[PDB]
Amino acid sequence: LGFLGAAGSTMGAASMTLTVQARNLLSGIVQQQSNLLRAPECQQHLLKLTVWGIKQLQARVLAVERYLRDQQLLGIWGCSGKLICCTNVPWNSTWSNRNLSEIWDNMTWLQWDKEISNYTQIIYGLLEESQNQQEKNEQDLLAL
C-alpha cells in the first residue's frame, strides 16, 4: 500500500504507485528536517561539524542533485512533470524478448530493470535524440 508497496507486484499493477516513490524521492528531506523539526539543541551540539554536521548537509544536497539530475533527464526527453508518457522510439527485441502478458503481468519491476540493465544508456540516448528532432522541426514548421 505504502512506499515500495508494489515492489513485488507486477509492473502493470505497480504502474500507478510511482506517485508514492516520487514523493519520497524528495520528501525524505521532510522526514530529515522541517517536519522532523530540528530540535532546539540542533546547531549548538552540531557546531562540532565533523559529527552529523557537514555530512548531513552532504546527504541533503546529494539527494537534491539526484532529484535534479533525474528531472532534467526527464525534461530533456520531453514529458516534463509526467510520471508516465510514450515516445516515438519503437521497442527493439534485442533489449528484451518479452510480451506485455509477460511484462505488464507475471513479472516485477526489479526483475525488469535487471533484464534491461546493459541497454539503459542506449534507450535514453534514443529518447534524447527524438526530443531534439521534434523541437527543431516544430520551429521550422512554425516559421513556414
Partner 1 sequence: NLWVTVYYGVPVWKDAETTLFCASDAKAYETKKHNVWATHCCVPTDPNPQEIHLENVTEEFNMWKNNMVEQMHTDIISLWDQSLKPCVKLTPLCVTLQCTNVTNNITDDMRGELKNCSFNMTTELRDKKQKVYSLFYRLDVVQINEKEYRLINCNTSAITQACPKVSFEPIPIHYCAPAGFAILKCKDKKFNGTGPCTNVSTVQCTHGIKPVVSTQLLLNGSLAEEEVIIRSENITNNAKNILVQLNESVQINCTRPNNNTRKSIRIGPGQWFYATGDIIGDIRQAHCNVSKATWNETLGKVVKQLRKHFGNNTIIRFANSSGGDLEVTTHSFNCGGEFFYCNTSGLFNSTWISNTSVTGSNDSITLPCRIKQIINMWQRIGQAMYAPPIQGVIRCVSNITGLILTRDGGSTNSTTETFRPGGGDMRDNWRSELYKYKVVKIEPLGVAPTRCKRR
Ligand X SMILES: *[C@@H]1O[C@H](CO)[C@@H](O)[C@H](O)[C@H]1NC(C)=O
| Residue list 8-37, contact with partner 1 (CB under 8 A) | 8-9, 11, 14-15, 17-29, 31-33, 35-36
92 makes contact with ligand X (CB under 6 A)? no
Q: Does 80 bind a copy of itself (CB under 8 A)?
A: yes
Beta bridge partners of residue 10, listed in sequence order? 108
Under the binding rule (CB under 8 A), the answer on residue 22 touching a copy of itself is: yes
Candidate list 13, 54, 89, 122; residue touching a copy of itself; CB under 8 A: 54
CA distances (Å), origin 98, targets 88, 117, 140: 20, 15, 39
Q: Residue 86's Cα: distance from chain center in Å?
A: 16
Q: Which residue in 21, 29, 30 sits closest to 63, CA to CA?
A: 29
Radius of gyration of the chain (CA): 20
Contact criterion met (CB below 8 Å) for 78 and 131: yes
Q: What are the residues binding a copy of itself (CB under 8 A)?
A: 15-19, 22-23, 25-27, 29-30, 32-34, 37, 43, 46-47, 49-51, 53-55, 57-58, 60-62, 64-69, 72-76, 78, 80-86, 128-129, 131-132, 135-136, 138-139, 142
